[PDB]
Amino acid sequence: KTYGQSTYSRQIKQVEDDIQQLLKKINELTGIKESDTGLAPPALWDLAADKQTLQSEQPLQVARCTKIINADSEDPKYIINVKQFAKFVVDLSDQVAPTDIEEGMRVGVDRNKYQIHIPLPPKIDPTVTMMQVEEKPDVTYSDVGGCKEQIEKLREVVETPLLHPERFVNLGIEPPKGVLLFGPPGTGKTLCARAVANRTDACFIRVIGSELVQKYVGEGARMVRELFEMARTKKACLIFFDEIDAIGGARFDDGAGGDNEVQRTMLELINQLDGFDPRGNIKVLMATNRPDTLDPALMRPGRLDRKIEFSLPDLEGRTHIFKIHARSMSVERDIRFELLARLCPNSTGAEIRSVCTEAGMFAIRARRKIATEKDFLEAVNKVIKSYAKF
Amino acid sequence: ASKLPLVTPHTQCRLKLLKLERIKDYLLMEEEFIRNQEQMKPLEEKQEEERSKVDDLRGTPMSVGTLEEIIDDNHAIVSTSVGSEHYVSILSFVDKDLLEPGCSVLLNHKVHAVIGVLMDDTDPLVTVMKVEKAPQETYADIGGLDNQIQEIKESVELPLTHPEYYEEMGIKPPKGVILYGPPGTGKTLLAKAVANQTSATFLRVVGSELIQKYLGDGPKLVRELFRVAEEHAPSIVFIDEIDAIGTKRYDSNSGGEREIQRTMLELLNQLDGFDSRGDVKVIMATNRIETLDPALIRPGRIDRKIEFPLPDEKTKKRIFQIHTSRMTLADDVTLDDLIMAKDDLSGADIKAICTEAGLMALRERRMKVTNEDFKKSKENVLYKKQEGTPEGL
Amino acid sequence: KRFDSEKAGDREVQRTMLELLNQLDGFQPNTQVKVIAATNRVDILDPALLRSGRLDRKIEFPMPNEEARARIMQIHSRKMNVSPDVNYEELARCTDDFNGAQCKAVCVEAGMIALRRGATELTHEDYMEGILEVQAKKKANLQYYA
Amino acid sequence: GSSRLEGGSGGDSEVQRTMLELLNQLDGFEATKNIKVIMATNRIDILDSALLRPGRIDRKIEFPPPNEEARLDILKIHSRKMNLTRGINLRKIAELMPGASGAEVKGVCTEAGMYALRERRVHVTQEDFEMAVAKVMQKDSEKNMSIKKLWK
Amino acid sequence: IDINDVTPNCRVALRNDSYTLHKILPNKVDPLVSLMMVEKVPDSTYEMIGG
Amino acid sequence: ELSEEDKQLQDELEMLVERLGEKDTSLYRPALEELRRQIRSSTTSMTSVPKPLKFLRPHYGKLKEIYENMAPGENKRFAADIISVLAMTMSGERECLKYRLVGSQEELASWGHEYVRHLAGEVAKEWQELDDAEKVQREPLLTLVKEIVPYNMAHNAEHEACDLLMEIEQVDMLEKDIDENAYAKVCLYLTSCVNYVPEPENSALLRCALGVFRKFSRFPEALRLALMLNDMELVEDIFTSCKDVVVQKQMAFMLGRHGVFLELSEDVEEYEDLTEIMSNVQLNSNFLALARELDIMEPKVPDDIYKTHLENNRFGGSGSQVDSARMNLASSFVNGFVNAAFGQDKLLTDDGNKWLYKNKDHGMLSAAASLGMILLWDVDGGLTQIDKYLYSSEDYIKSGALLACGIVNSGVRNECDPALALLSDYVLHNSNTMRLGSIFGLGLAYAGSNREDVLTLLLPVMGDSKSSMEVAGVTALACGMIAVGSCNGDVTSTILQTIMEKSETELKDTYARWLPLGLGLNHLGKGEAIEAILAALEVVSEPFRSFANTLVDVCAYAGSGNVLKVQQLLHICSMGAHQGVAVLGIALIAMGEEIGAEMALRTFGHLLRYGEPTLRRAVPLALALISVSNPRLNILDTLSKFSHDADPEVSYNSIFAMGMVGSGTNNARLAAMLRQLAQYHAKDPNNLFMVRLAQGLTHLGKGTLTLCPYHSDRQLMSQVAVAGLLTVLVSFLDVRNIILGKSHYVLYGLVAAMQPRMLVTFDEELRPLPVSVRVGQAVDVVGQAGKPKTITGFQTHTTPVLLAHGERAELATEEFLPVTPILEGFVILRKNPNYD
Ligand SMILES: Nc1ncnc2c1ncn2[C@@H]1O[C@H](COP(=O)(O)OP(=O)(O)OP(=O)(O)O)[C@@H](O)[C@H]1O
Ligand SMILES: Nc1ncnc2c1ncn2[C@@H]1O[C@H](COP(=O)(O)OP(=O)(O)OP(=O)(O)O)[C@@H](O)[C@H]1O
Ligand SMILES: [Mg+2]
């Protein structure tokens, strides 16, 4: 056997093993043989063997998707274009009211007289619907420390104006609508963005700059245009471009053509942001390690109105970060976290989290279950000093 | 099988024992009652004939369409093969866990209502990147590292073996390990070993294999590579010869280097970005590391960084006896005489010496390999050094 | 501009450009539709498009001069409740090399700073702090200059 | 082949599926099976490296252009299944064909046969061979100088 | 029909109203690998490749 | 190599088997000290059985012999200890504990955690084996545990500390060294492990937790625990002990929520306000504050709930003709439910007589009582409004007014007894309908108060001549609900007497099922203490005997989760209508721990897949009970399946169940399902009635009301609420004739369990004070190192937020420090001194 992990190890192992056996036994005693035809658990062929399927197949006919192209005369008469089938001039069934149908919206029509019965949501590139956040992160504004003025500005530009419009509307200030976050790698940009996404109360979209380069000409611009149309359907949304330097490259066309399609997509984003077509309720963020490369047209107010500098944290912020990350630990009681803050010279958040984890490591390798000071000193050594030359 | 989570301390304890004993006892009551019912009545006939009703509802000429958007409410837009787009009703017997956009759905012929789904191929890229067992050898064939292998084991293997250790204290494992050192020193081999020894799906890629000749293909490749790694449970990725893709990132450059930088940004986001990386680890190798980008090898992206020195005096003996292991040698083999020289030999150099000696032994028909052959082979292999002798010294 | 290169793709844009050229002034003269355009770079547009028959009148837009800067600031700060002490001539003079789209930043950020400091009406210092915000300048850790 | 992810396909190109199946088959069987797979190429560098791994086709052999003896031997073998006259001196034909290649010596045979056919006979003659080799080598040098002019 | 003989990649004739496999039509193997065996490759030695 | 060197070093002493035995002193101390240093040394990586321990294995017998009986001064002690250390790998007898029992008493920390854990386990085993006769042998063990426990506390090992001090049953010692830094964890765990543990031990654990929560002056938590235990005297000690007035406010709110009362002496400071708070009198003011803040005042008529126009009007003309009486009764019910407690109503208040006259016969009864539902928790003006309908021509309208007074007074304890004052007249009256209205209202007007005057008024009626089985049953219900958990003898006596008074033919009437319910409803929570009654019911007819016994058994062990009772009921299932109450009980016993509830869901799925019709028509109600106001997807699916069912009884029960499970949730998925479901059974009168009722329940209040009996972290079990739920559910066991017949007023039995879902935060002075509160699901943080976050999926709202089931609210800012750590219901806040 082994050294002995815990007194109950064997007892829990036994209860798990017989749990597995009883689960297998019920599996055999209930059937549930995997079916290659995608068919539900027999206890879930429910309303399915009968009584809803047989009641849904009778009244619910098959409508066919069609894309309205024109709505001529006040009298209902609709030209729809069924995909790869035909193109017709049809009328409205009674269920839909005339106001519901507009030009350009997908509609459903029946298979006999092709009259309109239901609208439908527009078609969005599968690669442009996933950038919605769906499940929001849990990081919050207590997890970001040593950046207090920066977070204040970000919160006053992306967050406060949506929650309390009347403050700004009364005095008559249209709040800035863009932020450029720039600072050394690993200083707190993406984390503050995560926090903003968690706290905010409106649609959030994550776009990577490297996600807008495409093989076929004139696709990236379409992607940007669709993204902004989608974001404009919502009531209010935030878009957070990462590594925007990916496609905001400076314009240097000369001689043989080089990186020109990226330039067209960049111009399309520029025109979407601030341009003839009004930008509705949208707020934009960008993060870059290298803000200089961004072109003169993007970095201009009206598109990126604010510029927040993230600098390496000061000593107070250093200890604060140490303490935030050393929270869910099984750690000793008294650690002079000021000592640890001093002992690491200018170092970023990533340094500090690495310090915490390396201290946990040096605790484990010593077969200890509570982290002490010596663990943290060893951690700081192994992190700062040893990995200096990189 | 969709069992309850104990969510006691999760570490061996009395509460984990009582929440565990309770589920066991309920399963016991259920099993007893079920066995009683089965003895009292088979129900085989009743469970049957439900298949018959289902197959009655789904007519014989079932049609394979292609789902394209689920309205979230037991409805769908299913596209027939030609290209038409219908708006059908999802019935009650389709296992909805298997319904996602792009799935080959099985529709009714007259009514196209969704009545099933089908499996798909498993090789978008899974086959081409997964390496299976390493043909070279297991941890046995590697010697002299000891400390490095220990680091890797703790970084990538130990968090899979016994999560309790890390979990007990509230610290997550390191994120990624970058293997750096002089060429021919045991990086790729150690990755191969920790691959063939662990229990996850290990994927390997060459950096020059991410340099694509159509725009926006490198970023797609990296995005996919990190896309079929969460589909597959715990997973490991090893991007070898990364130097060819991650470089200092000098801005005064023209050509396809911009695409290189753009794929580097995609990777830099995948490793640590907006979303949570799930359960995956990232190993990397680079013979030349001083030239990587600070944001790629920064702490939260790659916590562990491993140096790989050359064999010094004795690891040379170990490697030599490892590669000479399978060959009949004459009883005059002065191996130390070959090792004692401080010729800065590398591991791959040792393999080259072994193979060349074996090959000339084959050339001369001789049933055994002689020391003179090994020394001649050593001279021949070292002959591939060159350079300007007085210069620089 | 068109050019002779072995790399494809740009040819398609050039070709739709030829079609636009022909639409402006070509066979079948069109005398009912007029065209506008805007560009930051005119040094890269094709001569056949700057030709004196398709795009006849070309108009230059200079980085605004002092009078223009005061005018722009005044136009944009019209709604905000500003005090009767702000000397827009001063604010024009301390705003060298400011493209017109920059008071928007200054005007608005002055309002924002007035909000931050819990104020009601703006004052010269509010606009000055706005300007220091818009320039976006960094320090070198020291101020050896005299 | 020449790579496993080349055009962004994701390993699903047919050119790449054939290579994958070839790799699987090569790794199927053992070294001790008396089944040696000889592979050839006119362009080594483009050739994929996934073939040249250990446990696969490593050993390579260079091939310089053939020398005089090699040229004569190759001509002899390729003309073997042709009607010839008597006193045919292929050594002389080679002497009149310096710095030629395999395809050149393959073309000279067909040309000479066709000229003999125009002569309305069943046999090729040494004079006919001389004229054919003159034409083939003249067109070869013409192609070489045309390539040079294109480079110019 | 016994399913054992319905191999993948085989032609079959399906009925009109309700497609029901009710024959197994022939297939063309078209051997493309059985046209190049040369046996001992006679008249091909080291001797006539002098050099 | 290194292997050779270490082996040679180990042999340097292994070869000298008697190195200490040799007379020379140079090998006495130094050799054994060096061995201790080498063995105690740690290694790298896992390295199971570190190199020293592995290497000393073969030198085991001689290792013992060198100890044997040598000099006792130091050599014997050290040798014994080192033997104990190497006594780990062999994994044989208790050599570790034997040798540490006789050896050097060196600090344990020098040995490490691993050995300390192993020695703790060995000590636990030895104490278990050791008979109490060897008291002297226990003093060394108790010394060892007294040393072990502090090492476990200082090394963040509290869960195992409680475990060990449990195995030896000494859980009262935790107090003497618990310290501040590590008390929250120990109380949390010690409670968490208190429902899953057998009976006699659970009380001791709870005593321990309460004692500690006192020791550190943490009072409201101690009150929580004391009520859990259901000891009223400890609740006195907790309440009175406190001197801080605001904390007493907070205890008052908690107590008032529980529906338990404590009668302060008149000398307590600010007595009037304590009593006012504990009366839930102000609850209407706060409810209306919340309703105004969320701007949800507007009354919703039933049509808005129906949204018929959305559904495809295939039969918009001459469609299915459904019963008008049933439709208008259902409309009255849904109007009462949707506007409940908000006071106003577009339908009735504007013109209520016309709506009441749209209904028919008994529909006038439930229709009128809908008005009392509407003004619930508004005693003051409730009587002012209901006065008109109290005096009417139709008897049904008058009894409706009565049941309405009963509802309005419900849950709120006024000192003026309007309910007892008014409902006194007719309780003995002739008209059985009038009596039924009076009694149901009065029982709903006090349930859980255990008022002796009410009891001595009501109790005779169950023995009256002019008491039909409906009247007898309603009376038994009223007593059970007014004597919940009171082990009150009078109610039990009269109930039993009436039960044994009736002939076999009478017992066959379904309204006799309402006597066993009263009996079992008197005794809630007291398992194993009913065996006398189980003997008292052994003299009933076989079918009714089984029914009464099973029912009281299940009503005894409510809120237990006793697996043995689960197994016994399951044995019963695998016959009459007994089995229906067995099925309900399977859920009643297991309405506690989540583990119980989910495993019971599985058992119910199996019971439906395979089962007999009597079983099948009770599974829906148990599924409803096990999740009330907790619309989990799986219950919804496995219920909607049986909604569209051929077996009509199953259909009614499932539709009522899916209406409940969503009670007061406003679920979009559920509302859509029920709209579709009305579409399906548009031609079925009974199913359509059940559908309309469910559409009301789902929109109970407007999402601001929840029946869930449990509260305060799903831990405190409410007795009035569970009483009402049992009353309503059991009726449905013959759903067809009672509910879909002449007895639908029982549906007001849910009023017992109606509470709000608010979180309205007050300052020390009882004024609103909005604070940003993170709202989201809960996380269990038992035995998790550090202080790991205790919410996931959180959204930051303002104070007056609605907490659906399982939603725990935290404070966004450290600005205010709350009093009670359960930020639920009403809470008080105070300023943090060190805010910055
Ligand atoms: N102020 C901080 N407080 C807490 N954690 C921090 C802080 N700054 C950085 N970190 C840690 O740094 C890790 C690195 O991610 P982060 O979002 O900070 O990177 P970044 O600054 O956006 O970097 P990049 O420039 O490479 O995009 C975060 O996971 C967080 O753990
Ligand atoms: N310590 C060692 N034990 C066993 N084999 C070794 C050792 N060091 C080097 N080798 C040999 O080195 C050969 C080269 O493969 P390896 O994976 O070590 O390369 P690498 O160090 O990753 O090279 P590169 O820096 O070019 O990526 C392996 O086949 C192995 O035979
Ligand atoms: Mg290497």
Could you say which ligand is closest to the alpha carbon of residue A356? 1
Helix or strand (DSSP H, E) at C116: helix C101-116
The CA A187 to ligand 1 mean position distance, Å, reads 5
- Which chain B residues contact residue F790 at CB under 8 A? none
Contact with chain A for residue F633, Cβ under 8 A: no
> Which value, in Å, is the radius of gyration of the alpha carbons in chain C?
23
Whether B198 has a binding-site annotation, put simply, is: no
CB B184 near ligand 2, within 6 Å? yes
C-beta B112 within 6 A of ligand 2:
no
Quote the ligand 1 centre to A351 CA distance (angstroms).
10
**Ligand 1 in contact with A191 (CB < 6 A)?**
yes
The C-alpha angle F215, F220, F225, rounded to 5 degrees, equals 80
Alpha helices (H) along chain D: 14-26, 68-78, 90-95, 102-118, 126-151
H or E element that contains F609:
helix F594-609
Residues in chain A within 8 Å Cβ distance of F787 = 327-328
| CB spacing of E51 vs D77 below 8 angstroms | no
Residue of C nearest to A172 (CA): C80
Q: How many CB contacts within 8 angstroms connect chain B with chain D?
A: 30
B287 close to ligand 2 (CB < 6 Angstrom): yes
DSSP classification of residue F49 = S
Nearest chain C CA: its distance from A305 CA (Å): 6
Chain B residues in contact with F46 by the CB 8 A cut-off are 158, 162
Token pair for D3: 């790579």
Q: Do A249 and B252 touch, CB atoms closer than 8 A?
A: no
**B246 and B300 in contact (C-beta within 8 Å)?**
no
Q: Report yes or no: A25 at the C interface, CB cutoff 8 Å.
A: no
- Angle at CA of residue B383, ends B381 and B387, nearest 5°: 130
Token duo for residue B369? 């390999």
Instruction: Give yes or no for a contact between F679 and F718, defined as CB atoms under 8 angstroms apart.
Output: no
Residue/partner pairs of C8-17 with CB below 8 Å, 24 or more apart? C9/A217, C9/A261, C10/A257, C10/A260, C12/A217, C13/A217, C17/C46, C17/C49
* F contact chains, 3+ CB pairs < 8 A: A, B
Contact F729, F621 (CB under 8 A): yes
Which chains have 3+ CB pairs within 8 A of B?
A, D, E, F
Ligand 2 and B65: CB distance under 6 A: no
- How far, in Å, from the CA of B180 to the mean position of ligand 3? 8
A308, A262 Cβ separation under 8 angstroms? no
E19 and B CB contact within 8 Å: yes
Type of residue at D86: R
- How far apart CA A121 and CA A107 sit, in angstroms, is 9
Is residue A96 within 6 Å of ligand 1 at its C-beta? no
Dist. CA B347 → ligand 3 center (Å): 9
> Which structure tokens are listed for A219?
């696709």
**DSSP strands (E only) in chain B:** 63-64, 66-70, 75-79, 85-89, 105-107, 114-117, 176-180, 201-206, 235-240, 280-286, 304-307
Q: Encode F677-690: b = buried (16+ Cβ within 10 Å), e = exposed.
A: bbbbbbebbbbbbb
CA-CA distance, A308 to F626, in Å (whole number)? 53
Q: Which chain B residue is nearest to residue E15, measuring alpha carbons?
A: B61
Tell which one of B148, B152, B180, B188 to mutate to probe ligand 2, the residue whose CB is within 8 A of the most ligand atoms. Answer: B188
Inter-chain contact A51–F788, Cβ cutoff 8 Å?
A: no
Q: How far is the C-alpha of A356 from the C-alpha of A301, rounded, in Å?
A: 40
Method of determination is cryo-EM
Chains F and E make contact, 3+ CB pairs within 8 Å: no
Best CA proximity match to D50, nearest among D11, D6, D3, D12: D3
Helix (H, G, I), strand (E, B) or coil at B69: strand
Question: Is E49 in contact with D69 (Cβ distance < 8 A)?
Answer: no
Atom 5 of ligand 2, nearest CA residue: B142
Which subunits have 3 or more CB–CB pairs within 8 Å of chain A? B, C, F
Return the residues preceding each gap in chain F, C–N over 2.5 A, or none: 574
Ligand with the closest atom to the CA of A285:
1
The kind and range of the H/E element at C129 are helix C124-135
Please state, in angstroms and rounded to a whole number, the distance separating the CA atoms of residues F515 and F537: 12
- CB distance B319 to ligand 2 below 6 Å: yes
Spacing, Cα B288 to ligand 3 middle (Å)? 10
Interface residues of chain C, partner chain A, Cβ below 8 Å: 3, 5, 7, 9-10, 12-13, 40-41, 44, 79-81, 99, 101-102, 104-105, 108-109, 111-112, 114-116, 120, 134, 136, 138
- Contact criterion met (CB < 8 Å) for A213 and B262: yes
Instruction: Say if ligand 1 is within 6 A of residue A146 CB.
Output: yes
| Ligand 1 geometric centre to CA of A144 (Å) | 9
Identity of the residue numbered C54: R
Q: Give the C-alpha separation, F323 to F316, whole Å.
A: 17
Using CA atoms, how far apart are residues A330 and F697, in angstroms rounded to an integer? 47
Eight-state DSSP code of residue B130:
B
Q: How far apart are CA F217 and CA F237, in angstroms?
A: 13
- Is residue F803 within 8 Å of F816, Cβ to Cβ? no
Please provide the DSSP assignment of F631-677 as one string. --HHHHHHHHHHHS-SSHHHHHHHHHHHHHHTTT---HHHHHHHHHH
Of F647, F654, F591, nearest in space to F620 by CA: F654
What is the spatial distance between Cα F713 and Cα B135, in angstroms, rounded to a whole number?
57
Neighboring chains of E (3 or more beta-carbon pairs < 8 A): B, D
Please indicate whether, in this complex, the C-beta atoms of B221 and D5 are within 8 angstroms of each other.
yes
Ligand-binding site membership of B186 (annotated): yes
Number of neighbouring beta carbons within 10 Å of residue A137: 17
Q: How far is the CA of F597 from the centre of ligand 1 (A)?
A: 42
Count other C-beta atoms under 10 Å from residue F568's C-beta. 16
- What is the C-alpha separation between F362 and B200, in angstroms, rounded? 69
Q: Which residues pair with F818 in a beta bridge?
A: F829
Residue from B185, B189, B306 whose mutation best tests the ligand 2 pocket (most atoms within 8 A of CB): B189
A191, A243, A322: residue to mutate for ligand 1 pocket, most atoms within 8 A of CB? A191
Question: Resolution in angstroms, to 1 decimal, for this deposition?
Answer: 2.9
Collapsing DSSP states into helix, strand and coil, what is residue B116?
Answer: strand
Q: Give the number of beta-carbon pairs within 8 Å between B and E.
A: 6
- Supply A265's token pair: 């997509």
CB distance B141 to ligand 2 below 6 Å: yes
Contacts of F311-319 with C-beta under 8 Å, sequence gap 24+, read F311/F675, F311/F676, F311/F678, F311/F679, F312/A59, F312/A95, F312/F679, F313/A95, F314/A59, F315/F682, F319/F682
Selection from F587, F579, F651, F590 nearest residue F625 by Cα: F587
Residues facing C122 on adjacent strands: C82
